Amino acid sequence: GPSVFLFPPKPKDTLMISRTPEVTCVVVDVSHEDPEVKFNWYVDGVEVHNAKTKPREEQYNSTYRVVSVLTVLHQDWLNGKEYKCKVSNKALPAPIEKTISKAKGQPREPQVYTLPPSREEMTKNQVSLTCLVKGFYPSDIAVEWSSNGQPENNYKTTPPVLDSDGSFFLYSKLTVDKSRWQQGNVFSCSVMHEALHNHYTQKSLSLS
Amino acid sequence: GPSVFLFPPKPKDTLMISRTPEVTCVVVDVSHEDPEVKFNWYVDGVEVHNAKTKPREEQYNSTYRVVSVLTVLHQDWLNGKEYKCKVSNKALPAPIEKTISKAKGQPREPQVYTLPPSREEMTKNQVSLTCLVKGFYPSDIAVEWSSNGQPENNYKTTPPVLDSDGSFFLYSKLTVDKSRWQQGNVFSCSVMHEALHNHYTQKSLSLSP
Ligand SMILES: *[C@@H]1O[C@H](CO[C@@H]2O[C@@H](C)[C@@H](O)[C@@H](O)[C@@H]2O)[C@@H](O[C@@H]2O[C@H](CO)[C@@H](O[C@@H]3O[C@H](CO[C@H]4O[C@H](CO)[C@@H](O)[C@H](O)[C@@H]4O[C@@H]4O[C@H](CO)[C@@H](O)[C@H](O)[C@H]4NC(C)=O)[C@@H](O)[C@H](O[C@H]4O[C@H](CO)[C@@H](O)[C@H](O)[C@@H]4O[C@@H]4O[C@H](CO)[C@@H](O)[C@H](O)[C@H]4NC(C)=O)[C@@H]3O)[C@H](O)[C@H]2NC(C)=O)[C@H](O)[C@H]1NC(C)=O
Ligand SMILES: *[C@@H]1O[C@H](CO[C@@H]2O[C@@H](C)[C@@H](O)[C@@H](O)[C@@H]2O)[C@@H](O[C@@H]2O[C@H](CO)[C@@H](O[C@@H]3O[C@H](CO[C@H]4O[C@H](CO)[C@@H](O)[C@H](O)[C@@H]4O[C@@H]4O[C@H](CO)[C@@H](O)[C@H](O)[C@H]4NC(C)=O)[C@@H](O)[C@H](O[C@H]4O[C@H](CO)[C@@H](O)[C@H](O)[C@@H]4O)[C@@H]3O)[C@H](O)[C@H]2NC(C)=O)[C@H](O)[C@H]1NC(C)=O
Secondary structure, rough: EEEEEEEEOOOOHHOOOOOOOOOEEEEEEEOOOOOOOEEEEEOOOOEEOEEOOOOOOOOOOOOOEEEEEEEOHHHHHHHHOEEEEEOOOOOOOEEEEEOOOOOOOOOOOOEEEEEEEOOOOOHHHHEEEEEEEEEOOOOEEEEEEEEOOOOOEEEEEEOOEEOOOEEEEEEEEEEEEHHHOOOOOEEEEEEEOOHHHOOEEEEEEEEO | OOOOEEEOHHHHHHHHHOOOEEEEEEEEEEEEOOOOEEEEEEEEOOOOOOOOEEOOOOOOOEEOOOOOOOOHHHHHHOOOOOEEEEEOOOOOOOEEEEEEOOOOOOOEOOOEEEEEOOOOOOOEEEEEEEEEEEEEEOOOOEEEEEEEEEEEEEEOOOEEEOOOOOOEEEEEEEEEHHHHHOOOEEEEEEEOOOOOOOHHHHEEEEEOO
C-alpha cells in the first residue's frame, strides 16, 4: 500500500549560502491500523541522524501522509553525495528505499544575454523583455527578474532545452508596460547556477 | 500494474494536409506472463476498428511496452472530436480508459517577433537568432526556420509555456555562423497555427545596419 517519494532541494536553496537545503521524503497511503512509519537516512551508505519527522497529515481519502525532512550541507549536495531514505511500515513486506543526488556530469557555465523587444511589439500595450540563458549543465538553474532591489514577478521561464552539444538553454520572458520601458527603467535578469562565478550572475536591460 | 498514456498528434501533422495525424495509446508495465494487451478505440462514443498495434517493445526493467496507433482525420481533430482508448489486460481488474481532444477554448492568434543576437554574443564563433511566438491558443503550433526557399535545420524550439493569461508562448533559437549573419543574409521564422490567417505567417530577420 504505502508509496514513497523522495524530492531534492530547490535549486535556489542549494546555491544560496544563507538558505537551508532540505531533502524531503514523502510517504503516502498509510492505513489507520498501520499508522507507525519509521525513516532511516543514509549518505553514501553512512547512517545520518537528526532528521525531522513532521506530524501525520490525515488526508481527504481516509489515509495518512507522513513526511521526514533532512537538512543537507551545501557542499555535500554540490559534490554529488547520494541521499537515501529507507521507509519501514507494517503494511510493507520489505522496507522501501529511494535515492537522490545532483545530476552527475561536468558542470558548464551559462552565458546570459538580454534581448529588448522588437519594434513591431512596441506598438502593443505591453512589451516582452527576453533573457537567453545558454550553455549550462546540469539543468538545475534558477532565473529571476528585478528592477533595483525590488523584484518583478510578471515573468515566465521556459523548461531547459537540450542543445546540439551536451549543454542546455532556456528563455525567460518578463512582460512590462510599454510606458515603463520607454521611461528608461532598468530591468535585471538574475541567474543562479552551480557553475557560475559565485553561483550568481546578473545582466541588465534598458532603453538606449 | 499496467499504466496507460494517450498522446495527441504532432501539431505539424495536424496542420499540414500531406502529413498523417496519429493518436498513440502507450501501455507500459506489462508482465511477461500477462503479455496480451487488447485495445478498443472510440470517436465520440463510436467504436472504430482501423488501428495498428505495434509489436511489444521489451524494456530495460524487464517489462513490455505496447503501443496502438490510430490515424485521425485533419478536420475531425480540428473540429474537436474526443478520441478514447480502452485498454484491457489480465493484470488489470477493470479496463482502463483515457480520452483526448483538441484543447477546447477560443482560438487565439500568435504574435511573431524576431530578435537579433546581443552584441555580447557577437564576439562568439556562432550567434543565436531568436523567434518569440506569443499569445496563441491552443498549444498546437509548428515553427520552422529558412533562408530563401532553402530551410535552416540547425535550430531548437522550446515547449509551449502557459502565460499569465490563458495564452501560450515559446521561443525558437536558430544558430548560424557569425560570418553569414554579418554578410547580411535574411533568415525567416515561419509559424503555423490554427488561428493564423491562412494557417501560416512568416517574419524575417537581418543585420539591418
Ligand atoms: C520501465 O521503463 C519504462 C520506459 O521508461 C524509459 O526508460 C527507462 C529505462 C527510464 O530511462 C525512463 O526514464 C524512460 O522514460 C517506463 O515507462 C515510463 O513509465 C512512466 C510512468 O511510470 C511514463 O511516465 C509518463 O510520461 C509522460 C510523458 O511521456 C512522454 O515524454 C517522455 C520524455 O519526457 C518520453 O520518454 C515518452 O515516450 C513520452 O513521449 C511521447 O511519446 C509519444 C509516443 O511514444 C509521442 O507521440 C509523443 O510525441 C512524445 N512526447 C514527448 C513530449 O516526448 C507524462 O506525461 C506522464 O505524466 C503524467 O502521469 C504521471 C503519473 O505517472 C503524473 O505524475 C503526471 O503529473 C502526469 O499526470 C497527468 O497530468 C496532467 C496535468 O494536466 C493531467 O491532465 C493528466 O490527467 C494526468 N494523467 C495521469 C495519468 O495522472 C508520465 O510521467 C513514461 O512515459 C514511460 N516512458 C516511456 C518511454 O514509455 C516504465 O514505467 C518502467 N517500469 C518500471 C516498473 O519502472
Ligand atoms: C490521497 O490524497 C493524497 C493527496 O494528494 C493529492 O490529492 C489526491 C486525491 C490526488 O489528486 C493527488 O495527485 C494529489 O497530489 C495522495 O497523495 C499523492 O499520491 C500521488 C500518487 O501516490 C503522488 O503522485 C506523485 O507526485 C509526484 C510529485 O509530487 C509533488 O507534486 C504534487 C502536486 O504536483 C504534490 O501533491 C506532492 O506533495 C509533491 O509536492 C512537492 O513536495 C515537495 C516536498 O516533498 C516540494 O519540495 C515540491 O515543491 C512540491 N512540488 C509540487 C509541485 O507540489 C511525482 O513526482 C510522482 O511521479 C513520479 O513517480 C512516479 C511513480 O509513482 C513515476 O511514474 C513518475 O515518472 C515520477 O518519477 C507522482 O506522480 C502525489 O504527489 C501525492 N500527493 C501528496 C500531497 O503527497 C494519496 O495518494 C491519496 N490516496 C488515495 C488512497 O487516493
